Structure formats: C-alpha cells, structure tokens
Write a protein that binds this DNA or RNA. Structure first.
Ligand SMILES: NC[C@@H]1O[C@H](O[C@H]2[C@@H](O)[C@H](O[C@@H]3[C@@H](O)[C@H](N)C[C@H](N)[C@H]3O[C@H]3O[C@H](CO)[C@@H](O)[C@H](O)[C@H]3N)O[C@@H]2CO)[C@H](N)[C@@H](O)[C@@H]1O
Ligand SMILES: [Mg+2]
Ligand SMILES: [Mg+2]
Lengths: 149, 62, 178, 221, 137
RNA sequence: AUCGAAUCGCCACCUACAAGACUGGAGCUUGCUCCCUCGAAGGCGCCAAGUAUAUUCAUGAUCACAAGACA
RNA sequence: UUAGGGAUAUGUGGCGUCAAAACUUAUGGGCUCAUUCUCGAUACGUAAAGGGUGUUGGUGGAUAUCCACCGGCCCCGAAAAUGGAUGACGCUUAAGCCCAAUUAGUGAUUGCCCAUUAUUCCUUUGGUAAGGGCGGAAACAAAGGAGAAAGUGUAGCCCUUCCGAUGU
RNA sequence: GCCAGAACCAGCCCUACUGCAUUAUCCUGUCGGGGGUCAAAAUCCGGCGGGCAAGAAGUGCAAGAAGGGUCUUGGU
C-alpha cells in the first residue's frame, strides 16, 4: 500500500544530484514540494525537493511540521528509522550499484567467478535432485520411456 | 571480387571479398549520445545507412 | 526550480541641479531577472510618478536582497496587470512558497496562465509573508492542517537519464534496445 | 513466401543451420497508437527488424465515438474518377498500425521501403511468435504513464470492428485459447521454477565462502 | 632531455607491473602484464605470461592497451633491449622462460596473488549489454 | 556447387497473465501500525565442467573484416 | 547578403516520426476535452455581433449560502458545389495554449541542431595596394639541386604582407 | 614518388583548476502578542542583546602561465 507524504515520512531521492539519498520530510510546501532534511548525511541539508523526485518509504518518524533541526536528529535516533531502512533489500540494491559503479576490472572478475561458482553448484545440485524426482525435460522423457522400453 | 587487402602475401587466409572503410569519432552530436565520425580520405557509402558500424576501444586513453 | 526573478533594491535620485541643489532619493523594490531590467523598471517609475528621466538620472544603488531561511510561508503578492480591455486590474492572490522571490515568480506564472499577462504588463506591490490564520482562500488554507498526509498517486517515474531505455522486456528491468 | 528449391538445395549443399535474424518483438497491449508508432518508425529506420504483436489492444486517446468518426472522415476520401486507384482504407488494427508507421517513414524512397518491410505487425500473438523469446514493451508509450487516467481512451480493436474489420471475434477466440493454453503451461514448470530457486539457495553454503561475501557486496545473494 | 632514451611521455597508468588488456592485434582481449617500456619513447613490452594466457614477450604500444588499477609489483629481470625484436629462436625461447618463471615467482608472493593468476587467464570481451565508457579499470 | 563474403546473445528457468487511484499478506485508529518472502534484478554466458601450485599457446614479429564463427 | 575549399561558432527557425537536434529534457508552474471539412497549433497571412448552470481565476456587495460585474481557455453562433489537408502521420502525464528554465533551492558562465553570415586556417584572383631582394658574398669537376629578368600585362623577376571578390 | 599506425615539435581551436568585492527586508538569542492544538512547536508581529547563514549565496567583477583536438595547419 502507498505511503503518504506527511511530516516525518522518509523519502529517497529519485534522480537529482543525489539519486539515492534518504531524507525526512520536515514540512510540506504545497501540492508538489516539500522540505527534506536528513541530519545524518552531509549532502542532505534542509533543501526543497519536488515531489516528482521523491519516493516515500514505509518509515515515518514522529516529528512535527517545520521542526527545529535538532529535534529532528532526536526524532530519527529514537525511531531507528535509518537502521531499519539499512537492512531492507531495496537499500541493499542501492549500495550494490555503488560497488558496480566503482568496480575495477579485477573486482568485476571476482563477481564473475563468484557467479560462475554459484551457477556451477546450483546446476549440480539440480542434477543430483533430478535423478531422484524426474522434473526436468531430460528426466521426464526418460522416465516415460524406460517404463515401456 | 576478391580485391587486395592487407597481409595479402603474409596471411593468405584473410583474403576475402570483405572490405572495410575506416574513420575516427570526431565529436559528440546532440544530447542523446550520438557521435560525429569522419572516414579516412573519403565518406562512408550511403548504402551503409542503417547498417552495422563497429567502433573500437583503441586509441586508448585510460 | 530556484526561481527566475530576483529581489532588487534599486536606490536612485534625480540629479544635483541648480534649480534643485539637493534632490530626493527614492527607494524601489523590483522583481527582475537581472539588474539591467531592474534599473529600467526603476526609471520607468521615476518617469510616471516623479517626472524624472534616466538621462537626468543617478542610480545610487542596485543590489539584490537575499532571501531568508527556506520555510513554508504564505505570501500576499498584491499584484496588478494591464489588459487592453479593462485596463489596470489589481488582484491580491495569496500563495504558498518557501521564499519571497519565489512567491512573486509563481504570481508571474499564473498571471500568465489564468489571465495571459506578460512581464512588462505587470506591477508587483507589497509582497509579505502572512500567518496561517489570515489566509482567506481554502485552496491555500488547506495546507495549514497539522496532519495533511496525502499519497503520491498517478505518477511518472522516469529513468535517470543514464539508464533510460527504448525497449524493455514487459515484466522485466532489461533493455533489449537501448 | 516459402523458400524455393534453389533456396532449399543450397541449405542442403552447405548444411545450413536453422537461422533466425535478430528480431525485436513488441507487445503493444495498452500503448499509445502514435507514440509507439514513432518509436517503431525510428528503430526500423536504424536497421532493426521488428515484429509487432497484439495490435487490437492499441489505444487512441478520446471517446470511441470520436476516433471512429475520424476514421470515417478518412474513409470519405477516395479518388472520385477511379476509386481503384484511390486511397486504400485498411480496417485491421494490424493494418492501421502499419499505415501509421508508414506515414512516419520516407515512404517514397528505397530506404523507407526497406524499413517498412522490416515491420510485420500481427494482431493477437500468432503461434510462430509465442515461443520465440520474451516480448518487449515501450515504457515511454504505455497509456498508464502517457494518458491522464480520468480521460477516456479507445481500444483499437473496438474502433476498427465498427468501421469494417470482420475478424474481431476470430481474434478474440484465438487469444482466449492462447491464455488458457499458456496458463496451463505456466502451472507446469512451477515445480521447475521452484526447483532451481531452491537449488540456487542451496548452492550457497555448498560453494566457498570467499566467493559469497563478494557475491553479497554486489548484492547478488 | 627529449633525445635521452629515458625520455618517456607514457601515461602514469601504464607502469611496470600493471595488468593490461590487449584490445587489438593477435592476442586481443587477453590480460598481459606490462614489463617495461623500450628506449627512445618506444613501445611497451608485455609478457602474458605464456603459462597463463598464451601471450609471449611482445611489443605493443600504449594506445592499444587499457591499463587497469591492478598491479602485481614485479621487480624482475630487464635484459630485453630493443634488439631481441629484430629481423622461435633459441635466444628468444630462453629469454621467454627466464622472464616467464620470474613472473609466476612474483605473481604468487603477491597478497591475493592466486586471485590475480586467474585474472590473467580470463578474456575481456564486450558483452551485448555493457558500457565500457562508465567503468573504472 | 558455384560461394569468398556483410551479420557477432545463448536458453525445454525469459518466452503466462492482468494492474498502475496499485500489484506480498493482514489489522483498524483509513493513515498508520504489524508480519516474512522486506515488495528496485528471468536465468545464464564473458576461457580449468569451476576458484584449486594445471599442462599447450610465440616467428601471425606493433593497428588493419575476428586470419576465428556448432556457444 | 554571395571568389574556390575546410574547422569552429552563430543568426532566423527549430528539437515525436518524416528530418539534423530534448534516444518524447527538467529533479518548472498553470490552463484546456472539442461526436461526420472532424479542438488546437510557426508572425506577415485573407469571421463578427451575441450567448453558455462547461471549467478556471478576479473584483465589489451582502446573510457556509446567495447577488451584481470582469478576465483566460473551451463550446454555440459557424451553410456550398473532384477526395483533402496545423505540410503529413499523429498528439490529449501534449507532440496544444500562456509563462519560464538548462541538467536544477547543488554550491553561479555557454542544453544542441542547422547557413554562400561571423572568426580563423589554405588556395586563387584583382588592387588608389604597401614593403624587401636584384654590383651573382666566398666556395664547389665527373665517376645537396636549380633559379635570380630594374619588371603594366606571361608558364606572372623572386619573396613577404594587407584588403576586396555575387550581379541584369 | 604507395597505404596505414604511433611518437614528438610548433601553431591554433576545446574544456578542467578561482579570486576580489557584496550581504541586514538577513542570522541568532531570549521577554512580550499572536496563533493553532489533545496539550505546543511553528507560520506572524514587536522590544534590545549579540552577530560570519560563510562548494554560504545560483549576486557584481573575474586576470586561476594545463588534460583533449588537429584525416581542424606546418614540420621531423
Ligand atoms: N564519379 C565517377 C567515378 O569516380 C570514382 O572516384 C570516386 C571515389 O571513389 C573517389 O574517392 C576517392 C577514393 O577512391 C579513395 N579511397 C580516396 C580518395 N582520396 C577519394 O577521392 C576523393 O579525395 C581526393 C581529394 O583531393 C580527390 O582526388 C577526389 O576527387 C575525391 N573524390 O572520388 C570519386 C567520388 O566522386 C572513380 N574515378 C570512378 O569510379 C569514376 O570515375
Ligand atoms: Mg535577399
Ligand atoms: Mg552582361
């Protein structure tokens, strides 16, 4: 279910000069702009974001409208909203591109030998479970063959 | 016809009907990532419009 | 969008004549794109109010006015505009913006849409941040509710200009072309 | 066009593997008619081979009565002297789309005829197109991002059935029979789709752990 | 100083020890290690080593090489002048193996040095969906 | 059988289907709280059949259509 | 505003396809729905009076509701003789109208596309053209080379420099 | 006296790296009078106490003696 724009609602910036940074709505200007501040991040000082560039998250600190910029740092510390976000899967996809957009050619090789490992293991586990149950196409056709040939 | 390529005497296995025209990317063209290339000493044939052009990684800068 | 108009305080004066050995110095608030427009709107108003020309003219100052802390305020942009039929209509037009120079910019963008009036056919008077309990229209007064809470429905989430595509794979985040 | 015996003996003298060219197949369900046609008219002219599918599901903005009148104003045009030499008025949604693409091409040169014969434009999904790869989509033309949802729209298969196009019900029984068939195929292999993902979670901890915290740095766990 | 043989104008990324990508020539897409640069602003000289990817001691220039961040820190023998490469001879077959085995000696004493020996056997190709203009190397 | 060619991503995991005023599941204070599958990846492929002291590669000599092309 | 050619940058006009450019830009604001010559849309350039409880702003009165006015877009007013034209397709989370930006409340410059224009680099040609050199400096065989004319005009005496160039 | 590649000079054309001034209708501090709320923080107005909002401002001027072009010139 969609998450409403309210004072305290954590938004992630979509495609500004920030592109991935989370921020807390501290005031709503009108039908298309809010004030966004995250004291934990350096680039996230109290600025004005258009609501076409925000993405509301499921987390919402209990803070009031037009906060005092020091009770905001108190509000997201007691709520632990930044740490609950930091273990979601969508936040892991944000920090994963930051490795891909900073990877050297050697650690792109390490990702390729990691994926070819897991792929080699998942296809030999799939081998030694398809001998027991005839699931795959090689094993359905041979099971419906040896029973009458 | 099989006209004469490079390494005609040194490598007679690359003797082909295949030809090739060469060029350099000179500058970008617009905001959308198109390039403005010039071929060496001539122009690209107009038969090539819509057909495959390969751009390379050499001369290298990094 | 960090607005297109700037708050210039143009200070000027007629000239030290021998008729008038010490003339009156005038202050003028103008919202202009730059200071060359801002000086000329000043000498427009010196001509149509004080019979002073720019030729017999001194601009003592033309400096910008910095804004404020960015806080959501309510602005009364008391604004006037000229149409050929029913000339010099004056409206009041309360707005809702973070800065004073942005509030006048919004006034120039809906004197342009609601009424089709351009920059030089608009004069702007007395822009002031007013409190919540003085806002009269309910289309601005509806934002003073302490528990607003609306959803962003019916959106246009576009890609980030570095990963935009032409053909993606119908249920999939791929890119078969571009 | 079936291949002739000159084109069949050379695929036996030379042992020709079965070849398929690189063909992009667009699923045009819920697309803007002229925004999809302009994306396609540029890609075809950049040398893309494009099969277009499900043209009876294209959308045109406005009331169905509005877009049906605009076709009937188009059908009002005919060469009065000899209408066999006139504008030919195609009624199929698959042929409305070929026209709308063609009117965005340089139609009267050979480069614009080589690009209009690169487009195929079926309606429904025919049996040769079904199992040839995942369909693609044009996300800048998809009616849920391009039309304001309060405004009416018009399905092209419904505008065209009331101006001609006597095969509306044939397409509706060929696509009812497909989604019944393709949902029987998809309840099948659900113990093959779950077989791999319970083997790709089991491949972890059966693989060395120094290749897993590089597989968790890039988020591929 | 420009007429001196120690005058180079070569990039700071194409240092000795830097693992390269060949991009052209016979052994394109392979990963070879940069040994040194020939005098009078000469071309680079890369060995593979041949034990890993099949690239011998060969001349290549800087503009046909992507030099990456990964070094192996060679301090090996440099007795490869501008004249073993002049008009396999048993000299070049001996000069190969004497520098070949000095590479694997220096590959393995590197920290994460077995990961780099496998890195030299892989092949760089351009996949149908990847962007080499947005990559760090 | 002329025929040398241009093309350079494979899959019996995509190749089913709707939806965008929603589309993980529920609560009731209906905009917030709560649950795990955490709601932003179709899998592979990119040079040991798989991350481990394993064994060919030159002389095709410094770019040239990749001199290869059954994945 | 125009010698024969390049490179860069512009102007008028543009950037959904035709058709180069916003691979349909913004992390800008409003307004608009129109059902048989089919809303609208590049000036010059070839429908009015009047009407609307369509929508969107304003102004002045009065007791959450009425009253008089004024504006924007849209509709009505609005009927012709080959089939027909915002140039065509189309567009309606505009690809329409009015404002505004330039990669976006991030930290200051110029988004980019097109000329017989502009800047600059070559070559030609003509000047109310402007300067220099022209007393062979020495020296030099075959088995470093040739030229050097006191000149309107040449295959121009040889160099250097500057400006112009279309036309019945 | 043919075709390519790199190198290095010079010239010319690109783009990186920024200083000087200016803030005040402004920043901050508390006591008011005002607001709304479940209570109160804010918007707002006013006293005199301090001030530097400091890659701080999209405000005025900028002189910061390069990395890339040159099948955009000549040369070795
Ligand atoms: N149009 C007639 C044809 O012209 C042909 O030549 C055509 C082209 O092949 C030729 O292009 C050649 C190209 O072959 C070769 N690869 C390089 C050469 N530089 C190009 O020539 C081009 O560049 C130089 C610049 O001064 C000029 O000599 C030439 O006029 C110009 N066309 O120039 C002509 C383009 O109009 C052949 N002579 C022949 O097929 C026939 O005569
Ligand atoms: Mg004229
Ligand atoms: Mg004459």
């Amino acid at each position: 279910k969609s998450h409403y724009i309210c004072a305290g609602r954590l938004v992630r910036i979509l495609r500004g000069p920030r592109q991935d940074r989370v921020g807390v709505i501290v005031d709503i200007v009108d039908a298309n702009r809010v004030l966004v501040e995250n004291p934990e991040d350096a680039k996230m000082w109290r600025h004005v974001q258009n609501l076409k560039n925000v993405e509301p998250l499921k987390y919402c600190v209990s803070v009031s409208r037009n906060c005092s910029a020091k009770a905001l740092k108190d509000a997201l510390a007691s709520s632990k909203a930044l740490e609950k976000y930091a273990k979601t899967r969508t936040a892991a996809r944000v920090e994963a591109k930051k490795a891909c957009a900073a990877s050297t050619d050697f650690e792109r090789y390490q990702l390729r030998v990691a994926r070819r490992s897991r792929a080699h293991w998942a296809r030999k586990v799939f081998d030694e479970k398809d001998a027991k149950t005839p699931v795959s196409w090689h094993k359905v056709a041979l099971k419906k063959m040896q029973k009458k040939a | 016809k099989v006209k004469r390529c490079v390494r005609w005497s040194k490598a007679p296995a690359r003797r082909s009907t295949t030809r090739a025209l060469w060029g350099r990317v000179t500058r970008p063209h617009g905001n959308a990532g198109m390039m403005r290339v010039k071929f060496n000493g001539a122009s690209v044939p107009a038969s090539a419009i819509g057909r495959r052009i390969r751009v390379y990684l050499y001369p290298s800068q990094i | 969008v960090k607005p297109h108009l700037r708050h210039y305080q143009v200070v000027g004066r007629e000239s030290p004549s021998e008729k008038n050995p010490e003339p009156t110095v005038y202050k003028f608030e103008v919202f202009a794109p730059n200071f060359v427009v801002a000086k000329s709107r000043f000498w427009r108003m010196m001509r149509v109010k004080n019979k002073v020309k720019a030729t017999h003219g001194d601009v003592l100052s033309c400096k910008v006015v910095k804004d404020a802390k960015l806080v959501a305020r309510n602005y009364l942009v008391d604004i006037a505009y000229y149409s050929q039929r029913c000339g010099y209509t004056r409206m009041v037009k309360e707005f809702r913006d973070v800065s004073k120079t942005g509030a006048v910019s919004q006034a120039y963008h809906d004197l342009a849409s609601r009424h089709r009036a351009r920059y030089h056919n608009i004069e702007v008077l007395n822009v002031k941040s007013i409190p919540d309990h003085e806002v009269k229209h309910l289309s601005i007064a509806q934002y003073h509710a302490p528990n607003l809470s609306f959803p962003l429905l019916q959106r246009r989430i576009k890609a980030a200009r570095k990963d935009r595509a032409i053909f993606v794979k119908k249920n999939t985040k791929r890119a078969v072309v571009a | 066009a079936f291949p002739s015996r000159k084109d069949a003996s050379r695929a036996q003298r030379k042992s020709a593997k079965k070849h398929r060219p690189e063909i992009i197949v667009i699923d045009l369900k819920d697309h803007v008619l002229g925004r999809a046609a302009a994306v396609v008219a540029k890609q075809l002219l950049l040398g893309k081979k494009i099969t277009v599918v499900r043209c009876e599901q294209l959308n045109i903005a406005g009331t169905e009565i509005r877009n049906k009148i605009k076709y009937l104003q188009y059908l009002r045009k005919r060469k009065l002297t000899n209408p066999t030499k006139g504008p030919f008025h195609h009624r199929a949604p698959s042929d409305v789309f070929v026209r709308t693409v063609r009117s965005m091409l340089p139609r009267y040169t050979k480069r614009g005829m080589k690009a209009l014969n690169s487009l195929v434009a079926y309606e429904g999904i025919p049996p040769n197109v079904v199992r040839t790869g995942g369909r693609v989509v044009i996300p800048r033309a998809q009616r849920h991002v391009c039309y304001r949802s309060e405004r009416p729209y018009t399905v092209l298969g419904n505008m065209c059935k009331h101006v001609g196009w006597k095969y509306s019900d044939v397409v509706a029984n060929l696509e009812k029979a497909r989604v019944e068939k393709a949902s029987r195929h998809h309840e099948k292999q659900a113990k093959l789709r779950e077989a791999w993902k319970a083997a790709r979670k089991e491949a972890l901890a059966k693989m060395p752990k120094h290749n897993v915290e590089v597989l968790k740095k890039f988020g591929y766990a | 100083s420009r007429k001196s043989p120690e005058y180079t104008t070569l990039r700071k990324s194409c240092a000795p020890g830097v693992i390269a990508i060949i991009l052209a020539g016979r052994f394109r897409g392979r990963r070879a290690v940069i040994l040194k640069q020939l005098p009078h602003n000469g071309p680079l000289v890369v060995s593979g080593p041949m034990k890993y990817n099949g690239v011998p001691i060969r001349r290549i220039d800087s503009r046909y090489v992507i030099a990456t961040s990964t070094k192996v820190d060679i301090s090996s023998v440099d007795t490869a002048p501008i004249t073993p490469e002049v008009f396999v001879s048993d000299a070049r077959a001996q000069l190969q193996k004497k520098i070949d085995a000095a590479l694997i000696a220096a590959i393995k004493k590197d920290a994460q040095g077995k990961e780099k020996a496998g890195y030299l056997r892989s092949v760089f190709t351009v996949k149908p969906g990847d962007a080499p203009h947005r990559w760090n190397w």
